[PDB]
Amino acid sequence: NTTVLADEFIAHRLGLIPLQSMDIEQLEYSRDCFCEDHCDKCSVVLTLQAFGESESTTNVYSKDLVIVSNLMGRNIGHPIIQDKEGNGVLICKLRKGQELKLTCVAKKGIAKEHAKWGPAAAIEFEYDPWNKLKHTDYWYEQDSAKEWPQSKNCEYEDP
Amino acid sequence: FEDESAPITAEDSWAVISAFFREKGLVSQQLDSFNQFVDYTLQDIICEDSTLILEQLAQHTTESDNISRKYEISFGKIYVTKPMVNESDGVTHALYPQEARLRNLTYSSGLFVDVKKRTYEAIDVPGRELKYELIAEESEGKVFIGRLPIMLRSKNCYLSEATESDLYKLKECPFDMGGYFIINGSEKVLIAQERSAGNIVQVFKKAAPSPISHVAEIRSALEKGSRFISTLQVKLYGREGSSARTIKATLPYIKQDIPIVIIFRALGIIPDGEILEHICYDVNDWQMLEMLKPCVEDGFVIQDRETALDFIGRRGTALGIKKEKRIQYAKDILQKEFLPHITQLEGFESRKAFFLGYMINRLLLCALDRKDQDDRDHFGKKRLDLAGPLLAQLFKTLFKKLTKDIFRYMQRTVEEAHDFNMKLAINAKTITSGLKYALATGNWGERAGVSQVLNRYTYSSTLSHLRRTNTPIKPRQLHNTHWGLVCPAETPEGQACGLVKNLSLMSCISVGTDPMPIITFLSEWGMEPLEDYVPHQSPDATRVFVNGVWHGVHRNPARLMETLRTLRRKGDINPEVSMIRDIREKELKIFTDAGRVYRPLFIVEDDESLGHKELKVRKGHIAKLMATEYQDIDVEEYTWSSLLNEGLVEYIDAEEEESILIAMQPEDLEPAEDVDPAKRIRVSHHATTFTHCEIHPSMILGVAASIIPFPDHNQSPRNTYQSAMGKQAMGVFLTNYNVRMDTMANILYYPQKPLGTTRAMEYLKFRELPAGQNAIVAIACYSGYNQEDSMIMNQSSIDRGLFRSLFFRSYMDQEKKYGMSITETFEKPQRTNTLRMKHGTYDKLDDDGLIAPGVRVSGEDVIIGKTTPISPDEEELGQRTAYHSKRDASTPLRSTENGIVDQVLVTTNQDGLKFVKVRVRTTKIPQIGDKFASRHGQKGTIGITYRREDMPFTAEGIVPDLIINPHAIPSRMTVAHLIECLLSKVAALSGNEGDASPFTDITVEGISKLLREHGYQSRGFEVMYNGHTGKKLMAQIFFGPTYYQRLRHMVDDKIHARARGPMQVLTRQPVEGRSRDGGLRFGEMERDCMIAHGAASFLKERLMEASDAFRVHICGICGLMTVIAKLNHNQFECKGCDNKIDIYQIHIPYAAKLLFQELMAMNITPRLYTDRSRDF
Amino acid sequence: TXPGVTXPGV
Amino acid sequence: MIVPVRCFSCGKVVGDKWESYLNLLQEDELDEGTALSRLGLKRYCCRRMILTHVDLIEKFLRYNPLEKR
Amino acid sequence: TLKYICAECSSKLSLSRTDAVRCKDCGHRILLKARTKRLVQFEAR
Amino acid sequence: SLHKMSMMAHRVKVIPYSTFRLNLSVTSPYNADFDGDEMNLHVPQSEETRAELSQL
Amino acid sequence: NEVFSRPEWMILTCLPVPPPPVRPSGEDDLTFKLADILKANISLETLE
Amino acid sequence: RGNLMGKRVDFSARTVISGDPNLELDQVGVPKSIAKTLTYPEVVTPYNIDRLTQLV
DNA sequence: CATTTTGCAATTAGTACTCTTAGCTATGAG
RNA sequence: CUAAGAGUAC
DNA sequence: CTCATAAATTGCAAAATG
Ligand SMILES: [Mg+2]
Ligand SMILES: [Zn+2]
Ligand SMILES: [Zn+2]
Ligand SMILES: [Zn+2]
Ligand SMILES: [Zn+2]
C-alpha cells in the first residue's frame, strides 16, 4: 500500500462492498467450520492488485476484485455492479507510481454483527395511511389534515 | 449590471470580502508584523547606540607616550539571509520548513552585521583640548552574530513566493497559512499580547478613604529611543469636603510628590498667569481657576526658576550632587526622564510644560465632573503586540547583552594588551540561545505563555490559534469596543473567560510607520507650532496629537481632516494610520504606531447625483473584482489594494470608530423611507448621517464563530460553547498530514461540508477541510437512554463509516553523547547484557531498534530500543556482572493505546546524532462515552447504540443516525439547532446548499414552505414507527440531517482505575495522573462528606490503608520519633532518654511522619504521647 | 504590621 | 476524503455514483438536485451522502508519493 | 541489511549499524524504514 | 462534592461498556449530567468499612 | 514551660539536620540550603 | 492540606458517566475493566471457600 | 485634656486530562 | 525523576 | 582539555503638639 489512504481505511471501504449472495445458504459460517482459519466451504478469497502506471489518476474500482478461491459452482463472491459504466464502487485512487496489493477473506454475515452485511437498505413500512386506527395524534398548528401531506398509499383506502 | 454606477446590493459586498481575503489571507497580521520586524526594526535596533567607544587615556608618567587612544566598534547594515542549517560535518545548506519540522531543527536564518573598527589618537597635552584623528586603519567585513528564527511564509521564507504546485512539491500544504515559527521541530505561535497603549493620558477616580480623589497618568515611552517606561502620574489630593486641594505630580527618580507649580516654574514658566494659561485655556472658566488656586498659593514660596530647580534637586533621590549643580541635575531629570516620548534633547522645555498643563487640564476636567473617567477596557486604548514588537523588544534586550559582552571583552583585551579579534569577541550563541529559549518556552525574557504550541487538531483550531490574543492579568466583560475587532462569543469557559480573545475575520493589526511624513504634512497644511501657541489669542483651537505627542494646534481642523482623509484615501498616507477628530473636546489624534486593531469598512459619500447617501463602491468595482477572481479561477487586475487606493474602502480602528456612524446593511439603511411577518423585526434608525458601512455584519464573528449556522437563532452562551468546542472538533487540519510527524493527529474518515453552510466559511476553507459529518438526527424521548445530554447513536450508522477516525501518535527518541565516546546506540536490547529492560516484549524490534511500518503494537510493547553505556565490573542484585555494560533507555508504547505502526523516521539532529520518530496509527470508532456536539453547543455523550432495526423509522424507511433528547431544546434555547436541521433537510432534498449565514433574510417560513413543496411536513415532523413493535408513535418526531462534530474527548482516554501501583518517592503516596497509573485524589471536602456521613472507620481506611500507613516508633519519655529500632534483633532504643523498655509503636501516615520530621528539623518538637495527662 | 501582619511603624 | 461506499443511515451503495455525479455536473450542466435524482438518490440521507462529500483525495494525490516504485 | 527510503528521492537503500544515514542518490538526511514483509491482518469491519 | 448526598454508597452492577452507569434520579443529588462528566469510585477494603458504608 | 519550651530555646545553637528521607535526591533544595549553612558556619569558624 | 487533610488514595477509579433507566436507584454500572482493576480483599471463610477458590 | 495620623502584603471552588521545556554560562588553570 | 509553563474537561 | 566559582481583611507603635 503506497496510496494516500490508510490500510484499515481501505479495509473499511472493502468491507462495505456488496457481494453476490444468491446461494449463500450453501456456504457455512467460519465459526462452525472444521478448518483452521478459512476454507472453501466457508469463505471466498478475493485479491485486489492495482498499480499506478498511468500519468493521471487511476481509479481502483470493485470490478478489479478477482475471486481466488474456487467457488465450487456457487453464485457467491462476485461484487454487485449496478451503474452503466461497468466500474463498481470507487475503492481507491492511485497517482503515478503508486501500488496497492491486498487479499480479502469473505465470510457470510448478517446485518446484526455488522451493518456491512446488510442487504436491506431502506425498508418503507406504513399502515393505515388515513389514521383511522387513531394510532397517531397529528401535531398541527391550524388543521392536521391540511398540514400533513397525504401519503401515496391514501389512494388505496377509502377516506 | 448594465448601469456602471448603480448602487450595490447586500450580496455584492461578499465579492469585496473575497477580494480582501485574496490579498490579506487569514494570518496577514502575523506575516506583516514579522516582515516589519525583519525589514526595518532590526536595523533600528542595530543602529541605535551599539557604537562601543573605549577611550584609553595616555596615563603618561613621562611626556614621551602622551598619546591617548580611542577604540570604537560600529555596527553598520545588517544582512539577514535565507534559512540554512549547520551540520555535524560542517556542511551548510538551504533549509526548508518540512525539513526543520522532521529533523527537530529551527527554521532560522543567520544574521550578519558589518563591523567597522575605528581607532583614534590624540596628543595628551594638559589644558589643551584633545583632538582625535584617525590612524588610517579604517578596517571594515560581515560577522555572524546569531540566527533569527523565521516564521513560515514570511518575506524571508522559502515559501513566500511558492505557488500551489511548488507547495505540493515541497511537501507543504497549500491550505497551510504560515505565520508561525519552527522551534526544535515544533510549531510555535506567538499569541498577540494585549497591553495598555503608550503616550495616552488616562484619568481615574480613586476611592473615598484614599487622600487622592483623582489620578491622571501617562505611561510615556518613545519608540525610537531607549524604550524605557516612566509612569508620570498627576494626583489630586483632598476630598470634595477638603478645602486644601493641592495637585501633586509623581516625577520619576523623585522621593516626593512635587507640586505641579514647582515643576512649571522649574521648566521656565515663572509668572502665575503664564502657568495658569499653560494649564487652563478659558478665562471665564473660573471654576478651574478656583480649584487651581491652592497650587499657586502653595508654590508662591518659589518665584524663580533656579529656586524651583534647586528645590527639585534637593528632593532628588540620587543625593550625590553639590548645591550649585543640583540645577543641572534637575535639568537632566526634566530632560531625559520626564516624558521621554516628547523629546530627549534640550530647548523643548516649553513643549513638556504644555504637555504637563494638558495632563493637569484632563485631571481637572475629570475631577470637575465635566468628563467621565476613562474606561480601562476600551479596546482603542489597548495595543496588541504581535510577533513583530515582541521579537523586537526581546532582540533589543538580547543584543544589548551581546554588545555589553563585546565591550567587556574589548576592555579586558586592551587592559591586558592581548590581540584583538572579531570572532573571539562576538558570541552568536548569545542571540541564538536567547531567541530559541524565549520561543521554545512561553516565558518572554532572559511574562509567560507568549509562545505556545500551535494547535493542529483542526484547521479552524489552527486558524483561531493563529489569530489569538491574550490579556495578562473588569477585563472579562465583552466590551462594546470589541465590536468587529474580536469575536463577540469566542473565549474559554474556565478562568480565561474574556482574557483570551480571538480576532474578527476582517480585523487587522497595524505594523507601524514612520510619523515624520505626517508631521511634514501637518506643518505644510498650517499646523501652528506649539512653541508660539498662546491660548488667549487662539482659544477655539483644535489640538493635534501624533502618536500621543502633542505636536501643535490648528485653527481650521475641518479642512485639515478633509485633506488628511483624502491623502489616506489616495494612498499617500499609509491606510493603517488612524485619524480621530473629537469636536466637543476640540482635539485631533493621529495614531500610526503598531498594535492598533482596525477593521475595513465601505465608504459612504453624499452622491449629489442621486440626492442621498450611498456607498462609494458601485457595480463597476464589483464587476471588476468578479472579473479578477474569475481570471484567477485577460483584463486589468483589480485587488483589495485597488479599493484601498481609490477611496473605496477604509481602515477604521476603535479609536476612530468612536467618531463615526456605520450602516449595518446598505440596502435597508441608505435609502430614505404589507411586510413579511416571518422576518425578524428591524429598525430604520430614522437618521441619515452615515459615514461608513459595515461590509457585512457576519464579519463581527471570529473564525470559530463563523462556522455556526444561524448563530443569531441561539442563546449567546451556546455560541460561546460552540466557538470553544469547534477547536476540539475533529476533521482534517492539513492535507499533508501524511508527511508530518506531529505528536497527536485525529482525522475524520469522511468529513462532509455542512448542508447548512455560511458565506463566511468558504474563506476559512471549511468546505475544503470540514470538521464534522451530516448525521440524520431525530429529537425524541425514545428509550430514556438519551436523558441528560446523552445521545443514542445509530450503531448501524457507525458500522457504515459515521464519525470513524484515524489517530496518529508519534514518539520521538534521540541518542545523546554522555561524553566524548559514550554515544548512545539504538539497538535491540538483549536480556544477556542489558539492565532495566522494561517488562514489555522486545520481540517486535529488529536489529536496528525500530519497528518497521505495518507491525501491530500493543500496550507496553517496545517500539524504540535504546541502550546507554555504563561502568562495568560491578556485582549486585544477583544477576549483575561485568557483561551488563548497557542500561536500557527504551521508549515503549502507551499502556492503554495500541495500533498499527504507521511510519518511522530516522535522521540526524543538530549535533549529528541519529534520532527517530515512530508514528503509530489506530482507528477511533465511536462508542458509548464519546463526546459529540452540534454547531450550537449541544454537547453530549453516546448513552447507547441501537442497530438499524431498533431505531424509529419513517414511512420511507429512513432511520436516524442520532437521537437526542427533546429536553435539551427548551432549557438551552438552541433554536438554531432546529432551524439548521430543517434547512439541512430542505438542502438535502432539493440538492442546493443551505445558506445558514447569521444575518441573512432566511426565514423559518420559507424553509418550511420549501420542505412542504418536497412532500414532507412543513415543520420537519415525520410520523415514525417504534422499532420494537412497528406501531406508530403517538407523537410525531422532529427529524432531519444536522451537522455534528466528534470531539477529542473519548472515553477510552479517560477511563482510569488503580487498585495498587507506583507510589510517590517523597510522601509515599500514589503518584498523580492516569499517564502514570496514578491514584485518584481523596480531597478535603470528600473527607468532609465522609465525616458528615459519620463513617469514621471508612475515612481512616481511606487516609491510612488506601494511601499511606507507616509504623513509626516513639518513646514514652519524649514523644519524638527518635527511637532506633532493630526489629530482627528485637532492640528498641531512644538515645538520650537512656531507655529501652518504654517504647511504643504507632501507625501514622507517612505524610504525618514527614510533617513531624520537618517540624523537628525546624526546631519544633511534636511529642506524641499515648496516655491522657489531663482530664477532658 | 509588615506588610503584611508598614512596621510598625512606616 | 473519498466518496463513502454506503449511505450511513439506510445503506444504499453510493460509492459508485460519484464519478457519474461529477460527469453530470460537468458535461451535462445539470444542477445538483437533478443529478442526484438522476442517479437514483430519492431519500435525503443518500442525497446528503453524495451532495456534501468533499473529495480531499485529489489533494492527497498532488504530493509526490513517499514510496514510488 | 534492513531497508530504508529517502524522504525526497523515494529511493530504496539498505543500511547497516555503522552506516551514516544519508541518501546515496541525493544526500538528503531523512530516511524512513521500509514496509515489513510479514503479512498484516486487518478486520474489514 | 458539596454535600454528603454527593457521595453515596451504591451497589456494583458490572456492565460490558466503558462508562459508569447510574440511575437518572440519583443524578439529582450528585448534580451530574452525561455531557462529559466524570465520577469517582472508591472501594472499601474491609468488612467494617463495607458494612458502615452500606448501613450509613 | 519549664520542661517543653523555655525562652532561651528560641535561639538556635545546634541546628537539627533532617535525614535524606525528608530531602530525597541532583540534590533537593533543603540539601543545598544545608550545604550553604555548613559553608557559612565553616567560614565563620575559620575566621574566628 | 495536600497530603494529610486530602491525599491521593488507591482502590479508586474515575470515568465518564451515562444514564441507564434500567438500573435501580442504589445501583451503579461499573465497567468490566474497572471491576477487573479495583479489588476487594475477602478473608477466606468456610462459608466462601468454594466461590473464592473458583475465582482464584 | 484632647485628639490625630499614618502607611500594604498574604489569602483566598473542587478535581481531572494532555503536551513542552529545562535543569548556574563563561573563564581560569592544572 | 522534579519543577515551571501552556492548553483543556465537568 | 574539563572541573570549580561568580475583594477584603488585618494588623498599630510611634511622635508630635498645644
Ligand atoms: Mg455536565
Ligand atoms: Zn472452513
Ligand atoms: Zn526519648
Ligand atoms: Zn441513504
Ligand atoms: Zn535522495
Q: Which residue is listed with cell 479495583?
A: H38
Neighbouring residues of B974: CB distance < 8 A, sequence distance ≥ 6: B714, B715, B718, B934, B936, B937, B938, B968
CATH number of the structural domain spanning residue B537: 3.90.1070.20
Cβ contact B438 with chain J strand, < 7 A = no
Are B1033 and B1024 within 8 A, CB to CB? yes
B1071 and B1056 in a single domain? The answer is: no
Ligand 1 centre to CA of B781 (Å) is 19
Closest C-alpha to B15, from B769, B646, B632: B632
> B712: burial class by Cβ within 10 Å (0-12, 13-18, 19+)?
middle
Q: Please answer yes or no on whether B908 and E15 come within 8 Å at the CB atom.
A: no
Contact B1158 G21 (CB under 8 A): no
| Contacts for G39 with CB less than 8 Å, ≥ 6 apart | none
Instruction: Spell out the residues 6+ positions from residue B184 whose beta carbon is closer than 8 angstroms to its own.
Output: B104, B105, B106, B436, B440
Three-state SS sequence of D5-69: CECCCCCCECCCCHHHHHHHHHCCCCCHHHHHHHCCCCCHHHHHHHHCECCCHHHHHHCCCCCCC
Residues in chain E with CB shorter than 8 Å from the CB of A14 are 44
Instruction: Compare all CA atoms of chain B with the CA of D57 and give the residue at the minimum distance.
Output: B735
Judgement on whether residues B1042 and B1109 belong to the same structural domain of the protein = no
Measure the CA angle with vertex B477, ends B601 and B21; round to 5°: 30
Q: Give me the amino acid identity at B415.
A: E
Cell digits for B566?
A: 483624502
Q: Is B789 a catalytic residue?
A: yes
- At how many degrees (to 10) do helices B260-267 and B286-299 cross? 80
B493 near F CB under 8 A: no
Cβ within 8 Å, pair D68-E35: no
Return the C-alpha cell found at A131. Answer: 389514521
Q: How many separate domains does chain D show? A: 1
* Cα–Cα dist B360/B354, whole Å: 10
C-alpha cell at B919: 508514528
For B291, phi then psi, to 5°, come to: -65, -30
Torsions phi, psi of B1021, nearest 5? -75, 145
Centre of ligand 2 to C-alpha A103, Å, is 17
**Residue B372 neighbours by CB distance under 10 Å:** 9
Residue B1174 belongs to some domain of the structure:
no
Question: Angle at which helices B260-267 and B305-315 pack, to 10 degrees?
Answer: 120
Residue B135 lies in a domain: yes
D67 touches chain E (CB under 8 A): yes
Which bases of chain K are contacted by protein, using any atom under 7 A from a CB? 2, 10-15
Distance of CA A53 to the CA centre of its chain: 29
What's the CATH code of the domain at D17?
A: 1.10.10.60
Nearest to F2 by CA among F36, F40, F30, F44: F30
E strand or H helix at B834, and its extent? none
Ordered alpha helix ranges (H), chain F = 27-30, 47-55
E45: distance to nearest CA of chain A, Å? 6
One domain, residues B711 and B762: yes
Cell of B78: 545588517
Q: Which of B789, B888, B1053, B1142 is catalytic?
A: B789
Nearest ligand, CA B1114 = 3
> What is the C-alpha separation between B440 and B186, in angstroms, rounded?
8
Same-domain pairing of B358 and B219:
yes
Say which residues have a Cβ less than 8 Å from residue B644's Cβ, sequence separation at least 6. Answer: B571, B575, B650, B651
Range of the domain at B1041: 703-734+751-804+926-1062
Which neighbouring-strand residues pair with A58? A94
In single-letter form, the type of residue at position B48 comes to E
| Residues B382 and B492 both lie in one domain | yes
DSSP 8-state class, residue B1030: -
Domains annotated for chain E, with CATH where assigned, are 3-45 (2.20.28.30)
The C-alpha cell of B1127 is what?
526489629
Q: How far apart are the first and last CA of chain A?
A: 62
- Asked if the structure places residue B610 within a domain, the reply is yes
- What DSSP string describes B233-280? EEEEES-TT-S---EEEE-TTBSS-EEHHHHHHHHT--SHHHHHHHH-
Q: Annotation-wise, does F33 bind a ligand? A: yes
* Residue after which a domain boundary falls, among B511, B536, B559: B511
HSE value, Cβ hemisphere, 13 Å, CA-based, for G19? 9
| CB-count burial class (<10 Å; 0-12, 13-18, 19+) for B1001 | middle
Taking each continuous run of H as one helix and of E as one strand, the counts in chain C are 0, 0
C-alpha cell of residue B161: 513566493
Distance CA B60, CA B250 (A): 48
Cβ-contact B78, B431 below 8 angstroms: no
Q: Is B1158 exposed, middle or buried (0-12, 13-18, 19+ CB in 10 A)?
A: middle
- Do B19 and B50 sit in the same domain of this protein? no
Handedness of CA E38, E39, E40, E41 (dihedral sign): negative
Locate B863 and state its grid cell: 517500539
Q: What is the distance between the alpha carbons of residues B1158 and B828, in angstroms, rounded to a whole number?
A: 46
What is the Cα–Cα distance from H49 to B3, expressed in whole angstroms? 98
Nearest residue, CB atoms, D10 vs list A81, A92, A122: A122
Dihedral pair phi/psi, residue B777, rounded to 5°: -105, 135
Show residues, CB within 7 A, near nucleic chain I.
Answer: B 183-184, 186, 211, 409, 412, 427, 429-430, 436-437, 440-441, 453, 742-744, 809, 1053-1054, 1056, 1072-1075, 1078, 1080-1081, 1083-1085; C 2-10; F 38; G 26; H 6, 8, 14
- The answer to whether the beta carbons of residues B613 and B620 sit under 8 Å apart is no
Surface-to-core class of residue E41, CB atoms within 10 Å of its CB (0-12 exposed, 13-18 middle, 19+ buried): exposed
Residue B231 included in any domain: yes
E1, containing H or E segment? none
> What does DSSP say about strands B662-663 and B692-693: parallel, antiparallel, or unpaired?
parallel
Instruction: State phi, psi for B178 to the nearest 5 degrees.
Output: 75, -155
- Give just the sign of the alpha carbon dihedral D36, D40, D43, D47: negative
Q: Beta carbon of F36 within 7 Å of strand J? A: yes
**Distance in angstroms: CA B274, C1' I5:** 37
Residue whose C-alpha cell reads 468595482 in the numeric block: B621
Pairing of strands B84-85, B93-94: antiparallel
**Cis peptide, bond prior to residue C8, ω within 30 of zero:** yes
Label each residue of B946-980 as H, E or C: ECCCCCCECCCCCCCCEEECCCHHHHHCCHHHHHH
Residues 1-10 in C having a C-beta less than 7 A from any atom of strand K are: 1-5, 7-9
Tell me which ligand sits closest to the C-alpha of residue A30: 2
Distance CA D21, CA D39 (A): 7
Of the options 2.40.100.10, 2.30.40.10, 1.10.1740.10, 2.170.120.12, the CATH number for the domain spanning A1-115: 2.170.120.12
3 state SS of B448 = coil
- Considering only CB atoms, H13 lies closest to which of B788, B1057, B1069, namely B1057
Q: In this structure, are B981 and B1113 located in the same domain?
A: no
How far apart are alpha carbons B955 and B1016 in whole angstroms? 11
Task: Give yes or no: residues B286 and B332 share one domain.
Answer: yes
Return the number of other C-beta atoms located less than 10 Å from residue A68's C-beta. 12
- Number of neighbours of residue D58 by Cβ within 10 angstroms: 12
| The total number of structural domains that make up chain B | 8
CA distances to B502, B639, B873 from B22, rounded to whole Å, are: 21, 8, 70
Yes or no, beta carbons of G18 and B1065 under 8 Å apart: no
C-alpha B804/C-alpha B289 separation (Å) is: 77
C-alpha cell at B586: 476640540
CA distance A137 to A148: 12
Cell of B792: 443514542
Note down the domain range covering D31: 1-66
Which has the closest alpha carbon to B915: E23, E10, E29?
Answer: E29
Q: Output DSSP code: residue B853.
A: T
Contact between B610 and B666 (Cβ < 8 Å): no
C-alpha span between A79 and A91 (Å, rounded): 12
Separation in Å, CA B732 to CA B188, B579, B714: 20, 43, 27
Distance CA B9, CA C9 (A): 73
Single residue among B1031, B1047, B1062 that ends a domain in this structure: B1062
Residue B319, in any domain of the structure: yes
Domain boundary among B1027, B1062, B1097: B1062
Q: Residue B938 CB: number of other CB atoms within 10 A?
A: 25
By what method was this entry solved?
cryo-EM
What is the spatial distance, in angstroms and rounded to an integer, between the CA atom of H15 and the C1' atom of J9? 12
